[PDB]
Amino acid sequence: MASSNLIKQLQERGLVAQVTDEEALAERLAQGPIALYCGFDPTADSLHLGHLVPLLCLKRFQQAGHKPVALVGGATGLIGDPSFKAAERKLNTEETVQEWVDKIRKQVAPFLDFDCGENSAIAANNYDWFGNMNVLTFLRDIGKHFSVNQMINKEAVKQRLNREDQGISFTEFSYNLLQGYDFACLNKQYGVVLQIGGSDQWGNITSGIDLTRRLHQNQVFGLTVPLITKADGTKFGKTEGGAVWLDPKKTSPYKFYQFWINTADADVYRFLKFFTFMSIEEINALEEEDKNSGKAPRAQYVLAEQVTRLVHGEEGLQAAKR
Amino acid sequence: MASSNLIKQLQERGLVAQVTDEEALAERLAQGPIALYCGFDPTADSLHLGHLVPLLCLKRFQQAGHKPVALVGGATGLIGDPSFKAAERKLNTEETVQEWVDKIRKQVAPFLDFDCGENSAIAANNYDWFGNMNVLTFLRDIGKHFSVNQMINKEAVKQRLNREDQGISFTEFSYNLLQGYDFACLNKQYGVVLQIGGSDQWGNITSGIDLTRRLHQNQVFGLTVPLITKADGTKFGKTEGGAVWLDPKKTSPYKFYQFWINTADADVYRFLKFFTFMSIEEINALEEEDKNSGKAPRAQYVLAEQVTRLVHGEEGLQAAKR
Ligand SMILES: N[C@@H](Cc1ccc(O)cc1)C(=O)O
Ligand SMILES: N[C@@H](Cc1ccc(O)cc1)C(=O)O
C-alpha cells in the first residue's frame, strides 16, 4: 500500500496539530481522491480570520486532487459549540441564522473550485437533516451511542464542568452529538472519510469517527490544524475594533491588507506558511533574504499581497492601494 | 391561610417519603381543589404492584376533592427512566410502545372516577407534545434551562456516573428533561400544581418544579411515596415467576389474591395502610385484635379482599374463591 506525502507536506508548513492513525490516513490518501469536509457555524453573518486556516486547508486538499465539502452549520449554529469556551454562546433566532447561513455559504464558495471535474467542491448544511428531525428519534437513534461518562471527560468541556466559576447547559452539552452525526451523514451520502478542523475541534471530530463506525461500520479519519498564535502571546485575528472579517463590507480589503502589513517579524514567516500557497522553498528563501538584505523585510508585503488576493481577489488587492 | 390535613393524614399511613414546602402545599390544598398528576411509563403492556401505591394515592387525593391526572408515558417510554437503575433500560419500538400505552391507559381508568363533576380525572400522554417536537426546539427551548453540572449531581443517576462498573447513555441522561417538561406542560394546560410519584422520582419531580418556575413563573409542588419494603429485606412485588401484574390476563385475580394472603405478619398492617382505604383507626384495631385473639390473624384475609376488589372488582374477588 502506497503512502501519500500530503500529511507530511502539511506538517512542513506547521499545519498539523493532531491526526488520527496518520499511517493509515496517508495510505488511504494514496489510494485515490477522497471526499473530506470541514464545518463552519453561522455565529455571525460572516466568517473571520479564525476560520481562514481550515478553509484554506480544504483548498490545499483539493489542490492535491481531493474533493472538499464545505458544511455551514444551519442547525449547529442554533445550538452553539462550547469547545474550549468559557461561557455559553448567545442563542440566535432561527430566522436570523437562516439568513447568516446563506451569506456564509456564498462567502465560502469563491475559496473553492466547484467546477473542476469529479473533485469539484460541494456545499452542505446540517439543517437538512436536523431541521426536521424529531427529538425522540435523535435521543434514541443517535443518543444511544453516546456515553455521558465519556462526554464529561472530553477536554473541550472539562473546564466548564470542573471550574466552579462556570457551567454548561444541556443545549451546548448536546452539540458534540450533532457534529458527530454530521460526519456519519456526510460519510453515508458523499463518501466523506476525513474531517479537518481547528485545534479546538478534536473531540467533536473523534466523536464523529466513533459514531460513523457505530452506525455505518466505516473507518473515517480526522485532522486538526494548530491554534494560530502570535509570538507576543496575544490572540490572533483580534484587534481593538473586533475581529477581522472576510466580508469586504465588514472589513474593507484596504483594512484587511493593512492588518497583514502589521504582522510582526516573529510571526510573518510562519504566517506565510499558514495563509499562502507559496512553496516552503520560496518562503525559506524569503526569510533568508530578509535576514541578510539590510532592508525592510519584504515578507509582510508579500504576505499581505498573497492573502488579500486569496480573500478579496485581484479587485480587493487593487482596492488596498487606493 | 388555612392548612389542609391531607398531607398529615397520608403521613399517618406512612405514605409520605419527601415533600416540597410542606407548609405551603398544605395551605394551597386548603384553598380549594387542585389538579395533580402522576405519570406511568409503558415499560410493558401492563402496570404491576410497583405502580399501585402511587396510583391509589391519586385516588386518595381525589377522595379529598382534588382532581387527578393520570399520565401514560407515550414518549418517555421510548427513552427510559434511569433513576436508581443499575443498567440501561431496553429500547422498545414506537409501534409496540404505542399499543402498550393504549392498554395501560385502559387499565388505569377503572382506578379513578372520570364522572364525578369538576374533580373528574383526566388521562394524558406526553407523546402529544414530544411525538412531533423537533430536536433543535427541544435542545434550545427546554435544554437551555438545564445545567449539566446539576444533572450529574442528581442522586438518581450518581451511581451510573460514579461506579466504574456501569455508565449511562445520552438517551437516558435526557429523560429528566422530558419528565421535567411534562410537569410544566400539565401546569400550563390543566393548572396542575402538584406531582406525586414513587420514591425514586424525587429528582425528576423537582426538575419539573424548577422548569415550571423558569418557563411559566408558577410555584408547583412535589411529593413522593416511600419505597415499599418487606421486613425480610427482599423486593416487594417480586416473586419467582416475575412481577405481579394488574392485568388479569397476566396475573389472574385468584393468583393476585393468593399473593396478598401470603403477606408476612410483619408487613401486613403496614400494607393495609399502603394499599387500602380502611381508616387508620380500623387498621390499628385490627392489629390489636390479631394480637390478642389467639387465632390466625385476619389481617392477611382482609388485605387480600380489599386490594383484590380495588384491582379486579367484585368479579375478581369472586374469581379468587373458584
Ligand atoms: N464546530 C465547528 C463547526 C462545525 C459544525 C458542524 C460540523 O459538522 C463540523 C464543524 C466550529 O465551532 O467551528
Ligand atoms: N418516570 C416515572 C414515570 C413518569 C413519566 C412521565 C412523567 O411526567 C412522570 C412520571 C416512572 O419511571 O415511573
CSV table of N, CA and C in Angstrom, one decimal, chain A residues 13-83:
chain,number,residue,atom,x,y,z
A,13,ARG,N,4.6,22.8,6.8
A,13,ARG,CA,4.1,24.1,6.9
A,13,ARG,C,3.6,24.4,8.3
A,14,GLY,N,3.6,23.4,9.2
A,14,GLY,CA,3.2,23.5,10.5
A,14,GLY,C,1.7,23.6,10.6
A,15,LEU,N,1.0,22.9,9.7
A,15,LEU,CA,-0.5,22.9,9.7
A,15,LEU,C,-1.1,21.7,10.3
A,16,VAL,N,-0.4,20.8,10.9
A,16,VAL,CA,-0.9,19.6,11.5
A,16,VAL,C,-0.8,19.6,13.0
A,17,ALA,N,-1.9,19.7,13.8
A,17,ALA,CA,-1.8,19.7,15.2
A,17,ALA,C,-2.0,18.2,15.7
A,18,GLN,N,-3.1,17.6,15.3
A,18,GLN,CA,-3.3,16.2,15.7
A,18,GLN,C,-3.9,15.5,14.5
A,19,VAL,N,-3.7,14.2,14.4
A,19,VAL,CA,-4.2,13.4,13.3
A,19,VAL,C,-4.5,12.0,13.8
A,20,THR,N,-5.6,11.4,13.4
A,20,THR,CA,-5.9,10.0,13.8
A,20,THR,C,-5.3,9.0,12.8
A,21,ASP,N,-4.6,8.0,13.3
A,21,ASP,CA,-4.0,7.0,12.5
A,21,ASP,C,-3.3,7.6,11.3
A,22,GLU,N,-2.3,8.4,11.5
A,22,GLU,CA,-1.6,9.0,10.4
A,22,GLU,C,-1.1,8.1,9.3
A,23,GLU,N,-0.6,6.9,9.7
A,23,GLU,CA,-0.1,6.0,8.7
A,23,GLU,C,-1.2,5.5,7.8
A,24,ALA,N,-2.4,5.1,8.4
A,24,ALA,CA,-3.5,4.6,7.7
A,24,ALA,C,-4.1,5.7,6.8
A,25,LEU,N,-4.1,6.9,7.3
A,25,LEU,CA,-4.7,8.0,6.5
A,25,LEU,C,-3.9,8.3,5.3
A,26,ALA,N,-2.5,8.3,5.5
A,26,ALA,CA,-1.6,8.6,4.4
A,26,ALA,C,-1.8,7.5,3.3
A,27,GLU,N,-2.0,6.3,3.7
A,27,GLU,CA,-2.2,5.2,2.8
A,27,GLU,C,-3.5,5.3,2.0
A,28,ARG,N,-4.5,5.8,2.7
A,28,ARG,CA,-5.8,6.0,2.1
A,28,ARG,C,-5.8,7.1,1.1
A,29,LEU,N,-5.1,8.2,1.4
A,29,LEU,CA,-4.9,9.3,0.6
A,29,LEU,C,-4.2,8.9,-0.7
A,30,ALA,N,-3.3,7.9,-0.6
A,30,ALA,CA,-2.6,7.5,-1.8
A,30,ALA,C,-3.5,6.6,-2.7
A,31,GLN,N,-4.5,5.9,-2.2
A,31,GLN,CA,-5.3,5.1,-2.9
A,31,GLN,C,-6.1,5.8,-4.0
A,32,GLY,N,-6.4,7.1,-3.8
A,32,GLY,CA,-7.0,7.9,-4.8
A,32,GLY,C,-7.7,9.1,-4.1
A,33,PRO,N,-8.4,9.9,-4.9
A,33,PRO,CA,-9.0,11.1,-4.4
A,33,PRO,C,-10.1,10.8,-3.4
A,34,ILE,N,-10.1,11.4,-2.2
A,34,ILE,CA,-11.2,11.2,-1.3
A,34,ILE,C,-12.0,12.5,-1.0
A,35,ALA,N,-13.2,12.3,-0.5
A,35,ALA,CA,-14.0,13.4,-0.1
A,35,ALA,C,-13.7,13.7,1.3
A,36,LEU,N,-13.5,15.0,1.7
A,36,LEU,CA,-13.3,15.4,3.0
A,36,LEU,C,-14.2,16.6,3.3
A,37,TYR,N,-14.2,17.0,4.6
A,37,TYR,CA,-15.1,18.1,4.9
A,37,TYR,C,-14.6,18.9,6.1
A,38,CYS,N,-15.1,20.1,6.2
A,38,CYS,CA,-14.8,21.0,7.4
A,38,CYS,C,-16.1,21.7,7.6
A,39,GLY,N,-16.6,22.0,8.8
A,39,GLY,CA,-17.8,22.7,9.0
A,39,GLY,C,-17.5,24.1,9.6
A,40,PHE,N,-18.4,25.0,9.3
A,40,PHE,CA,-18.3,26.4,9.8
A,40,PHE,C,-19.7,26.8,10.3
A,41,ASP,N,-19.8,27.3,11.5
A,41,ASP,CA,-21.0,27.7,12.1
A,41,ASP,C,-21.3,29.2,11.9
A,42,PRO,N,-22.6,29.5,11.6
A,42,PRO,CA,-23.1,30.9,11.4
A,42,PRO,C,-23.3,31.6,12.8
A,43,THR,N,-22.2,31.9,13.4
A,43,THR,CA,-22.2,32.6,14.7
A,43,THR,C,-22.3,34.1,14.4
A,44,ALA,N,-22.2,34.5,13.2
A,44,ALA,CA,-22.3,35.9,12.7
A,44,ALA,C,-22.7,35.8,11.2
A,45,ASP,N,-22.9,37.0,10.6
A,45,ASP,CA,-23.3,37.0,9.2
A,45,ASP,C,-22.0,36.9,8.3
A,46,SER,N,-20.9,36.5,8.8
A,46,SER,CA,-19.7,36.4,8.1
A,46,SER,C,-18.6,35.6,8.8
A,47,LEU,N,-17.7,34.9,8.1
A,47,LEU,CA,-16.6,34.2,8.8
A,47,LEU,C,-15.5,35.2,9.0
A,48,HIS,N,-14.5,34.9,9.8
A,48,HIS,CA,-13.4,35.8,10.1
A,48,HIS,C,-12.1,35.1,10.0
A,49,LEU,N,-11.0,35.8,10.3
A,49,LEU,CA,-9.7,35.2,10.2
A,49,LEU,C,-9.5,33.9,11.0
A,50,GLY,N,-10.3,33.7,12.0
A,50,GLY,CA,-10.3,32.5,12.8
A,50,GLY,C,-10.7,31.3,12.0
A,51,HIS,N,-11.5,31.5,10.9
A,51,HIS,CA,-11.9,30.4,10.1
A,51,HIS,C,-11.0,30.1,8.9
A,52,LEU,N,-10.2,31.1,8.5
A,52,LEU,CA,-9.3,31.0,7.3
A,52,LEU,C,-8.4,29.9,7.2
A,53,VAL,N,-7.6,29.5,8.2
A,53,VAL,CA,-6.6,28.4,8.0
A,53,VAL,C,-7.3,27.1,7.6
A,54,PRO,N,-8.4,26.7,8.3
A,54,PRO,CA,-9.1,25.5,8.0
A,54,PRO,C,-9.7,25.6,6.6
A,55,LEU,N,-10.2,26.7,6.2
A,55,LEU,CA,-10.9,27.0,4.9
A,55,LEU,C,-9.8,26.8,3.8
A,56,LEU,N,-8.7,27.4,4.0
A,56,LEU,CA,-7.6,27.3,3.0
A,56,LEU,C,-7.1,25.9,3.0
A,57,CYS,N,-7.1,25.1,4.1
A,57,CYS,CA,-6.7,23.8,4.1
A,57,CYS,C,-7.6,22.9,3.2
A,58,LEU,N,-8.8,23.2,3.1
A,58,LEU,CA,-9.7,22.5,2.3
A,58,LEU,C,-9.2,22.6,0.9
A,59,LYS,N,-8.8,23.8,0.5
A,59,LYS,CA,-8.3,24.1,-0.8
A,59,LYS,C,-6.9,23.4,-1.0
A,60,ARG,N,-6.1,23.3,0.0
A,60,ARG,CA,-4.8,22.6,-0.1
A,60,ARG,C,-5.1,21.1,-0.5
A,61,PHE,N,-6.1,20.6,0.1
A,61,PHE,CA,-6.5,19.2,-0.1
A,61,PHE,C,-7.0,19.1,-1.6
A,62,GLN,N,-7.8,20.0,-2.0
A,62,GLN,CA,-8.4,20.0,-3.3
A,62,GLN,C,-7.3,20.1,-4.4
A,63,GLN,N,-6.2,20.9,-4.0
A,63,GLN,CA,-5.1,21.1,-4.9
A,63,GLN,C,-4.4,19.8,-5.1
A,64,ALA,N,-4.4,18.9,-4.1
A,64,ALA,CA,-3.8,17.6,-4.2
A,64,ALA,C,-4.7,16.6,-4.9
A,65,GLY,N,-5.9,17.1,-5.3
A,65,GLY,CA,-6.8,16.2,-6.1
A,65,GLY,C,-8.0,15.7,-5.3
A,66,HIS,N,-8.1,16.0,-4.0
A,66,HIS,CA,-9.2,15.5,-3.2
A,66,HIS,C,-10.4,16.5,-3.4
A,67,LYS,N,-11.6,16.0,-3.0
A,67,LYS,CA,-12.8,16.7,-3.0
A,67,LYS,C,-13.3,17.3,-1.7
A,68,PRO,N,-13.3,18.6,-1.6
A,68,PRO,CA,-13.7,19.3,-0.4
A,68,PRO,C,-15.2,19.6,-0.3
A,69,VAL,N,-15.7,19.3,0.9
A,69,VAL,CA,-17.1,19.5,1.2
A,69,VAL,C,-17.1,20.6,2.3
A,70,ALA,N,-17.7,21.8,2.0
A,70,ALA,CA,-17.8,22.9,3.0
A,70,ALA,C,-19.1,22.9,3.6
A,71,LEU,N,-19.2,22.5,4.9
A,71,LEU,CA,-20.5,22.5,5.5
A,71,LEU,C,-20.7,23.7,6.4
A,72,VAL,N,-21.9,24.3,6.2
A,72,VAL,CA,-22.3,25.5,7.0
A,72,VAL,C,-23.3,25.0,8.0
A,73,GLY,N,-23.1,25.3,9.3
A,73,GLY,CA,-24.0,24.8,10.4
A,73,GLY,C,-25.4,25.5,10.6
A,74,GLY,N,-26.3,25.2,9.6
A,74,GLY,CA,-27.6,25.8,9.8
A,74,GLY,C,-28.3,25.3,11.1
A,75,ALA,N,-27.9,24.1,11.5
A,75,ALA,CA,-28.5,23.6,12.8
A,75,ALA,C,-27.6,23.8,13.9
A,76,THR,N,-26.3,23.4,13.8
A,76,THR,CA,-25.4,23.6,14.9
A,76,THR,C,-25.2,25.0,15.3
A,77,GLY,N,-25.5,25.9,14.4
A,77,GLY,CA,-25.4,27.4,14.7
A,77,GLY,C,-26.6,27.8,15.5
A,78,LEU,N,-27.5,26.9,15.7
A,78,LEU,CA,-28.7,27.2,16.6
A,78,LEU,C,-28.5,26.6,17.9
A,79,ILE,N,-27.4,25.9,18.1
A,79,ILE,CA,-27.0,25.2,19.4
A,79,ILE,C,-25.8,25.9,20.1
A,80,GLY,N,-24.7,26.0,19.3
A,80,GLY,CA,-23.5,26.6,19.9
A,80,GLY,C,-22.5,25.6,20.4
A,81,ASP,N,-21.3,25.7,19.8
A,81,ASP,CA,-20.2,24.8,20.2
A,81,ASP,C,-19.4,25.4,21.4
A,82,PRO,N,-19.5,24.7,22.5
A,82,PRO,CA,-18.9,25.1,23.8
A,82,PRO,C,-17.4,24.8,23.9
A,83,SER,N,-16.9,24.0,22.9
A,83,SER,CA,-15.5,23.6,22.9
A,83,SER,C,-14.5,24.7,23.3
